[PDB]
Amino acid sequence: GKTTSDVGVNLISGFEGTRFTAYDDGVGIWTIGTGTTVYPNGVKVKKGDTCTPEQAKSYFKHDLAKFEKTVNESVTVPLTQNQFDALVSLTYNIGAGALKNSTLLKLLNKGDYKGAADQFLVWNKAGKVLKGLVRRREAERALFLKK
Amino acid sequence: GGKTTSDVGVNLISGFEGTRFTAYDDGVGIWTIGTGTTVYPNGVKVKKGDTCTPEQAKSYFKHDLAKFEKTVNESVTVPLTQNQFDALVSLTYNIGAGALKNSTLLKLLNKGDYKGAADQFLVWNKAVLKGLVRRREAERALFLKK
C-alpha cells in the first residue's frame, strides 16, 4: 500500500503542533509530542508526562504507520497520493472507527470522490464546532481535491 | 502602519522550512534549528549541538518574522495585496534582507512591474536545487493569486 508523504506529514504536524510535556487537547484527552495520546506500547498519555524530540518522533511514526494501515485496508478505490495524505490526516484526528463508520468512506468506496471530499467538512466538532477543526477539514479537503 | 504575515504566509514558510529541535546543517553550511532559525533574537548564531523547545522555536520564528516584515514594509514602495506580502516575506526569510533589497525583483516591483517581479521570484533557486524551485514556484503562485 501507500505511505504518508512529506506533504501529508507536514500537514499533520502543522495542525497537531509538537509539545514535550503532556497537555489537555481541549476535549479531555491528554496529548504529547505531535498529537500522541497513546504510546506504542498501549500506555495512555497522562498529565505530567514528558518526552524528548526522538521519543515524539518515534510515537508519531508508530501512529502514522497505524493510520496508514487503516486507510490502505479501508479504501477500495484508487487514490492519489494527495488523497491518501488527506485521509491519513483525517483518520489521525478522528480515529479508525470513525473513518470506517463514516458516510465519507461509504461515498469514497462507491467511487464518489466529490461526495467524500465534501464529507470531510462534517468532522469539525468538539462534542461545539471549533474553528481549528473547520480550517483543518478545509485544508484536508483542498489537498484531497488537488490534482 | 504596514502589513504583518498572515496565517497563509506563516503556513507556507513553516511548511517549507520545517521545524526541528536539534541544530542541523541546512546544506550550504549554515547551522539551523527551530523553524529555519539561524540567528537567535539576541544575535547569537545557531551552532552545532544546540537544542530548543517548541515554545522557543515559536519565539525565534516570531522574532524573525517581525524582522522580515519590516524589511518588506520599508523596502517596497508599491501597493501590495496580503498574498504578495506573504510571498515576499517567505522569499526574504529564505534569502535575506540584503539579497532582496539588491534584487532586480525589488527594482521591477517598485517600478510597478508586478508580473516581472513575480517571474523574478524564480531565479532564487540556487545554493540549482529542486526544493528551492518548488518553494519559489509556490511563492510566485501565491504572489500572483488574487
Author numbering:
A (entry chain A): 37 to 163, 165 to 184
B (entry chain B): 36 to 162, 166 to 184
Question: What did the paper state?
Answer:
As a proof-of-concept, five peptidoglycan hydrolases from the Acinetobacter baumannii proteome (PHAb7-PHAb11) were identified using PlyF307 lysin-derived peptide as a template. All these observations together indicated that PHAb8, PHAb10, and PHAb11 were highly evolutionarily related to T4 lysozyme and might share similar catalytic mechanisms of action.
Results showed that PHAb8 was a monomer, while PHAb10 and PHAb11 formed an asymmetric dimer. The two subunits of PHAb11 formed a tail-to-tail dimer with a rotation angle of –179.4° along the rotation axis and a distance of 37.1 Å between them. Notably, the N-terminal 36 amino acids, P11-NP, were missing in our PHAb11 dimer. We speculated that it may be destroyed during crystal formation. Structure-based homology analysis revealed that PHAb10 and PHAb11 probably belonged to the T4 lysozyme family and possessed the conserved Glu-Asp-Thr catalytic triad shared by traditional phage lysins and bacterial autolysins, namely Glu17, Asp26, and Thr32 of PHAb10, and Glu52, Asp61, and Thr67 of PHAb11. Our results showed that PHAb8, PHAb10, and PHAb11 were denatured with transition temperatures of 41.4°C, 53.7°C, and 59.9°C, respectively. Similar to the folding-refolding phenomenon of PHAb10, PHAb11 and its N-terminal peptide-deleted variant P11-C could restore to their native conformation after 1 hr treatment at 100°C, while its C-terminal peptide-deleted variant P11-N could not refold to its native conformation, indicating that C-terminal peptide was essential for its hyper-thermostability.
